[PDB]
Tab-separated table of C-alpha atoms and ligand atoms in Angstrom:
chain	number	residue	atom	x	y	z
A	1	UNK	CA	-1.395	13.676	0.437
A	2	UNK	CA	0.010	13.568	-2.760
A	3	UNK	CA	-0.440	10.723	-5.152
A	4	UNK	CA	2.169	9.566	-8.055
A	5	UNK	CA	1.062	6.491	-10.338
A	6	UNK	CA	3.570	4.792	-12.108
A	7	UNK	CA	4.253	0.688	-14.085
A	8	UNK	CA	6.897	-1.205	-12.029
A	9	UNK	CA	8.108	-3.374	-9.534
A	10	UNK	CA	7.287	-1.825	-5.908
A	11	UNK	CA	10.348	-3.901	-4.603
A	12	UNK	CA	12.217	-1.386	-6.511
A	13	UNK	CA	10.430	1.345	-5.247
A	14	UNK	CA	13.034	3.554	-3.479
A	15	UNK	CA	12.023	5.870	-0.692
A	16	UNK	CA	11.266	5.794	3.332
A	17	UNK	CA	8.471	2.748	2.778
A	18	UNK	CA	6.191	0.407	0.870
A	19	UNK	CA	2.463	-1.154	1.800
A	20	UNK	CA	2.331	-4.931	1.807
A	21	UNK	CA	-1.638	-5.537	1.690
A	22	UNK	CA	-1.566	-8.607	4.179
A	23	UNK	CA	-3.320	-11.508	6.308
A	24	UNK	CA	-3.296	-10.525	9.665
A	25	UNK	CA	-0.828	-13.460	10.643
A	26	UNK	CA	1.734	-11.777	8.482
A	27	UNK	CA	2.493	-14.713	6.478
A	28	UNK	CA	3.948	-13.535	3.079
A	29	UNK	CA	2.534	-15.692	0.094
A	30	UNK	CA	3.077	-15.852	-3.358
A	31	UNK	CA	3.127	-13.193	-6.083
A	32	UNK	CA	3.528	-9.789	-5.390
A	33	UNK	CA	4.221	-10.303	-1.780
A	34	UNK	CA	6.717	-13.486	-1.834
A	35	UNK	CA	8.507	-11.064	-3.981
A	36	UNK	CA	9.123	-8.899	-1.216
A	37	UNK	CA	9.982	-11.447	0.946
A	38	UNK	CA	12.207	-12.725	-1.918
A	39	UNK	CA	14.327	-9.565	-2.963
A	40	UNK	CA	13.750	-8.392	0.586
A	41	UNK	CA	15.170	-11.585	2.376
A	42	UNK	CA	14.037	-13.696	5.029
A	43	UNK	CA	14.689	-10.806	7.748
A	44	UNK	CA	11.371	-9.774	7.041
A	45	UNK	CA	8.931	-12.481	7.821
A	46	UNK	CA	11.181	-13.198	10.681
A	47	UNK	CA	9.959	-9.837	12.170
A	48	UNK	CA	6.629	-10.563	10.977
A	49	UNK	CA	6.793	-13.421	13.132
A	50	UNK	CA	8.095	-11.888	16.376
A	51	UNK	CA	4.949	-9.673	15.893
A	52	UNK	CA	2.053	-12.307	15.209
A	53	UNK	CA	-0.952	-11.875	14.772
A	54	UNK	CA	-2.809	-8.458	14.677
A	55	UNK	CA	-6.235	-7.498	13.368
A	56	UNK	CA	-7.661	-7.445	10.253
A	57	UNK	CA	-8.041	-3.314	9.545
A	58	UNK	CA	-4.519	-2.524	11.092
A	59	UNK	CA	-0.985	-2.570	10.337
A	60	UNK	CA	2.401	-3.164	11.357
A	61	UNK	CA	5.947	-2.121	10.647
A	62	UNK	CA	8.882	-4.394	9.232
A	63	UNK	CA	12.331	-3.639	8.217
A	64	UNK	CA	12.753	-3.608	4.327
A	65	UNK	CA	15.711	-5.978	3.980
A	66	UNK	CA	17.332	-5.383	1.025
A	67	UNK	CA	15.173	-3.523	-0.788
A	68	UNK	CA	15.572	0.212	-1.698
A	69	UNK	CA	13.158	1.240	1.318
A	70	UNK	CA	13.623	1.686	5.078
A	71	UNK	CA	10.306	-0.171	6.442
A	72	UNK	CA	7.572	-2.348	4.607
A	73	UNK	CA	4.013	-1.507	6.429
A	74	UNK	CA	2.177	-4.601	6.542
A	75	UNK	CA	-1.545	-4.037	6.448
A	76	UNK	CA	-3.971	-6.653	6.740
A	77	UNK	CA	-7.149	-6.723	4.570
A	78	UNK	CA	-8.035	-10.140	5.418
A	79	UNK	CA	-7.304	-13.251	7.519
A	80	UNK	CA	-9.802	-13.959	10.222
A	81	UNK	CA	-12.337	-12.294	7.983
A	82	UNK	CA	-12.513	-11.966	4.485
A	83	UNK	CA	-11.414	-8.780	2.351
A	84	UNK	CA	-13.544	-6.014	2.098
A	85	UNK	CA	-13.780	-2.538	0.544
A	86	UNK	CA	-14.436	-1.757	4.819
A	87	UNK	CA	-11.344	-3.975	5.643
A	88	UNK	CA	-8.978	-1.893	3.096
A	89	UNK	CA	-10.196	1.539	3.678
A	90	UNK	CA	-8.861	0.606	7.415
A	91	UNK	CA	-5.750	-1.456	6.306
A	92	UNK	CA	-5.101	1.978	4.653
A	93	UNK	CA	-5.911	4.608	7.228
A	94	UNK	CA	-3.891	2.003	9.557
A	95	UNK	CA	-0.624	2.064	7.422
A	96	UNK	CA	-1.189	5.611	6.701
A	97	UNK	CA	-0.458	6.425	10.263
A	98	UNK	CA	2.189	4.078	10.916
A	99	UNK	CA	3.651	6.263	7.896
A	100	UNK	CA	3.069	9.318	10.316
A	101	UNK	CA	4.452	7.926	13.461
A	102	UNK	CA	7.863	7.094	11.891
A	103	UNK	CA	7.898	10.391	10.159
A	104	UNK	CA	8.042	8.802	6.988
A	105	UNK	CA	7.963	10.989	3.677
A	106	UNK	CA	7.780	8.889	0.611
A	107	UNK	CA	5.524	5.839	0.455
A	108	UNK	CA	4.316	3.285	-2.109
A	109	UNK	CA	1.578	1.232	-2.037
A	110	UNK	CA	0.856	-1.520	-5.111
A	111	UNK	CA	-2.180	-1.579	-7.459
A	112	UNK	CA	-2.650	-4.936	-7.977
A	113	UNK	CA	-5.175	-4.369	-10.924
A	114	UNK	CA	-6.926	-7.550	-12.575
A	115	UNK	CA	-5.008	-9.157	-9.463
A	116	UNK	CA	-6.721	-7.742	-6.840
A	117	UNK	CA	-8.587	-10.979	-6.166
A	118	UNK	CA	-11.960	-10.731	-4.288
A	119	UNK	CA	-13.136	-7.114	-4.579
A	120	UNK	CA	-13.498	-5.329	-7.556
A	121	UNK	CA	-10.218	-3.728	-8.320
A	122	UNK	CA	-11.609	-0.477	-9.478
A	123	UNK	CA	-13.202	0.223	-6.051
A	124	UNK	CA	-10.077	-0.657	-4.143
A	125	UNK	CA	-8.050	1.545	-5.949
A	126	UNK	CA	-11.029	4.327	-4.922
A	127	UNK	CA	-11.083	3.283	-1.277
A	128	UNK	CA	-7.766	3.763	-0.994
A	129	UNK	CA	-7.013	6.874	-2.753
A	130	UNK	CA	-10.049	8.363	-0.608
A	131	UNK	CA	-7.721	7.525	2.143
A	132	UNK	CA	-4.626	8.702	1.025
A	133	UNK	CA	-5.783	12.165	0.426
A	134	UNK	CA	-6.773	12.693	3.928
A	135	UNK	CA	-2.920	11.695	5.098
A	136	UNK	CA	-0.840	14.352	5.548
A	137	UNK	CA	0.986	16.160	2.861
A	138	UNK	CA	4.302	15.703	4.661
A	139	UNK	CA	3.681	12.241	2.532
A	140	UNK	CA	4.487	11.432	-1.083
A	141	UNK	CA	2.438	8.477	-1.885
A	142	UNK	CA	3.398	6.627	-5.145
A	143	UNK	CA	0.820	4.028	-6.336
A	144	UNK	CA	3.004	1.496	-8.530
A	145	UNK	CA	0.597	-0.298	-11.114
A	146	UNK	CA	1.775	-3.647	-12.676
A	147	UNK	CA	0.560	-2.604	-16.042
A	148	UNK	CA	1.351	0.606	-17.832
A	149	UNK	CA	-2.410	0.615	-18.857
A	150	UNK	CA	-3.594	0.587	-15.493
A	151	UNK	CA	-1.446	3.163	-14.332
A	152	UNK	CA	-2.119	5.746	-17.039
A	153	UNK	CA	-5.789	5.332	-16.373
A	154	UNK	CA	-5.326	5.790	-13.015
A	155	UNK	CA	-3.287	8.837	-13.583
A	156	UNK	CA	-6.304	10.069	-15.951
A	157	UNK	CA	-8.173	9.542	-12.985
A	158	UNK	CA	-6.092	11.690	-10.530
A	159	UNK	CA	-6.208	14.764	-13.493
A	160	UNK	CA	-9.501	14.294	-13.931
A	161	UNK	CA	-9.664	14.838	-10.031
A	162	UNK	CA	-7.295	17.837	-10.213
A	163	UNK	CA	-9.350	19.579	-12.805
A	164	UNK	CA	-12.658	19.041	-11.140
A	165	UNK	CA	-11.589	18.761	-7.372
A	166	UNK	CA	-14.315	16.246	-7.443
B	201	NA	NA1	-0.225	-1.832	-1.193
């Protein structure tokens, strides 16, 4: 599946959906997540409550509130257990399967850069990418970076990839 890389606000992504890294209890915290709750609205966390706990590595779909997308796909990367490049690969494929299930066409993930927290940012991007490139080409995946710097580097990695087909 294709990948575009841009600096910007994920809350301002226009498309079928946006993927939200989450804890398996579906409790949206601060930072980007809270921003999604803010711009999105109460209804999002409400649906997350209706669903309840899920497994780390799995995904859950939710309406996107006032956001310019139809759904918000929640992918549990941690909660019952710490986040790992292992739990991320899973949360990604899981979110990618939901996208396919709902017949989505334009989905956007977020590249937290230095805000990745526990795992080495570069490696998380790699793992997420590996999974995405396996997803159906009926998808148009967009990586939204917080900084232009990290986005440009990502694009260069995407170019270096094409040019060689690593
Ligand atoms: Na994401």
